[PDB]
Amino acid sequence: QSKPWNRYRLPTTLLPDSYNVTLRPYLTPNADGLYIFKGKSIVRFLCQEPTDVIIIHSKKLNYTTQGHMVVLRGVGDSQVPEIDRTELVELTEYLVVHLKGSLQPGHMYEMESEFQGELADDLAGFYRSEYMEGNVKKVLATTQMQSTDARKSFPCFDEPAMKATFNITLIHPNNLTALSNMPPKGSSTPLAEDPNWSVTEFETTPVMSTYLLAYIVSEFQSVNETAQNGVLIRIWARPNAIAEGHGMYALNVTGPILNFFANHYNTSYPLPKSDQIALPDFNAGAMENWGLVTYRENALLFDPQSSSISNKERVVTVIAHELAHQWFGNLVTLAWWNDLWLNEGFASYVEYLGADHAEPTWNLKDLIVPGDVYRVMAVDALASSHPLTTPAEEVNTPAQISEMFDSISYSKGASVIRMLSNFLTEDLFKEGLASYLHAFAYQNTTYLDLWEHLQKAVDAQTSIRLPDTVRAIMDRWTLQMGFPVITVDTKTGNISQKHFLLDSESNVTRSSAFDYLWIVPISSIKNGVMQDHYWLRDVSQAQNDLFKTASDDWVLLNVNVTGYFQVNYDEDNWRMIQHQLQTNLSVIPVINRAQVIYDSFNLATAHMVPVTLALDNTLFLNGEKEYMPWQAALSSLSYFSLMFDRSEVYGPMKKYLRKQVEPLFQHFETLTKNWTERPENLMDQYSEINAISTACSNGLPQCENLAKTLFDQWMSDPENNPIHPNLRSTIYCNAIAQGGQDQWDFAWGQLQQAQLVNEADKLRSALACSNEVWLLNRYLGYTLNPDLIRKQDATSTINSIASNVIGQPLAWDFVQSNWKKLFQDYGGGSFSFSNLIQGVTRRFSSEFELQQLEQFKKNNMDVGFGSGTRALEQALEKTKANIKWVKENKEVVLNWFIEHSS
């Protein structure tokens, strides 16, 4: 019989009711350089079943409580047993209070403690963040509880289902602002023991999870809006960022987004206020703390003067994502981390819906397809993938919990939920969603609860008919990994499904309860006209006339790629599709014009179509003005460039892409009035960005001319940059590529004086575009100088140099020679040896290069590889795959490009 304090899950014998927590960060170090926080807490809990032990979470806390580590009292007139002893059990992160008698069912108890911890710069629990304002190093205190770190700030029953109300008090320097989940109760009062400090009490939280608590002490200022319903909206940031107006876009979109969600969810925003705060270098990206959402600065702030349209899109979607959680996740909370995919998957889908509401002309909802669907299919088409669902009993330790937060959980989660909403219809999905939120408000759920409420909505109507229960259908998409390729023979209308793997030689060893068969919702378009919807049942092969064609007709499946699968056709149908796109592309929805490209390249990788069929699918692009299909092609061809840009294949490839993109360049040349004014909507701006990128990188003289002229103009007047932020990355790069040390030194100067990270990033990247060996070598010589290149930017810069075909050997020589820097940078910040190894060896595709990677590895004796260990093994494995791919594809691909470049 194992002791309960040696088990990772808490007993269910005691449940929390409410907590008082007072925290006091000390933002001045103790002279040895240690920063601490002090705290005091009282938790009131109810005894459900008799027990003589209290087990509560505690991590890295020292107790200063009088007597034992806690004091234990009865609520009202309840008696309390005496404490035998208190002990900390570090492995399972518990404070354990052994009692001399048993607590009694139905009785409430209050347990008080006093404690302190390090206010470490570790982004965990209550922690410190250091940044610069002019001459001064500033330090603030802030929180990150996600997932199991509330217990690092105060002792608590730190599991998400164990909800309670929280009364937070902050004790802080009197000239700093204190924020938490709720509004402050009133004005701060001076601390009696030292009036240099103030005390800020916050209103009681709703019933809520520990992982969603937040409290922050800083010098931050805000911009504000009061919504019509009295809800106060604030964006918080560094005083200088606020003063420059960088919080305005976030402020602009927040009101509309909250309004969208209240309506979408049929549920009022559950808090009196909304704070969002931009933190410098918040590595977690963003965190949905209820009423006080934290973001890295570059995710929330926006500078219209220097930021591109893609920055704007990042802000509105990141906001919509975190605000989505203020209902789904925070109001109704998944009972355990094994169901994290539902929470993050749901937010990862509806972020597009929320953002679309704020920017209705942007067609943002489309972006889930390239952004999430095809992104996650890359890793879900591997034998090494995993199902969305995990048994709760397999997820116990904080490490196992962290593993829940991956591409599958977020992106496949979003994909399958989007598929679900689509086959139910949004109206029906929303009914079940509202029912679910209403039923479980301030409580906890599993994914089965959502399915049940969606089933109730289906059962209450007669229009939408499903081939099975919602649960049975969704089980196919959640209980087994991967997805099917749907293959259609249009001569017969025969339709088949099989588990899709990119590696046709791969062995799947993870068994499925369903033998890798799905229940698949299949929409289709025939000759541009929508057909009746179809469901492929759990069978390998079926037949339907919907998918049978005449000689001159065509069919296309999975309209707008709402379904989580890829489609293959017989060659005849592929040609009819190709013919349609060649003569009138408008007949096929833009998303599907992209899908044809995405799927065919994947199918070619899997040896299900010849690579030439996939390349044939790019032929229509000379008449394509829209973003997504061009994006599909560029994404699919980046590997081709990577394998071939040092070979005889490259000339014909460059020429072919010049032929394809020249008309688009011409189109935008006129549309933009000689480049003086951007296209109006987001998609058209993205298309222009990619068009100029593709034209210049493939050597279109007109683009090269544009880049030289603008950069010359900039050099003639450094303070007035004539290059629109959307075009900076391309214009900078191509101009530095054309020029020498004059263009290089100018951009270097601009980089050194750059006040803004995103602009500094563009400049750093563009400096790697030089075609002068001596410049790229000198530049490599800077990457390790922290006065010239930030340590956190070093590997990125080397990678950018490696990406330059000329820089490739230079960077590889640099990494080998200076690998004697692992013992200077496994302790001096991470560095990321893993990402650096992958970037520099990315191109390797020959036996000779494999020999060099092996010979470099022959320094196994000492120094090792660190966090890049086995990333080095990944590189050796990938090189082998590349060798095999180039050998199989070189001849066929060379001839295709030659043939189709006029």
Partner: peptide
């Protein structure tokens, strides 16, 4: 924690 995801992704 925050993920929208960057809008490329394709193997």
């Amino acid at each position: 924690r925050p993920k929208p995801q960057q809008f490329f992704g394709l193997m």
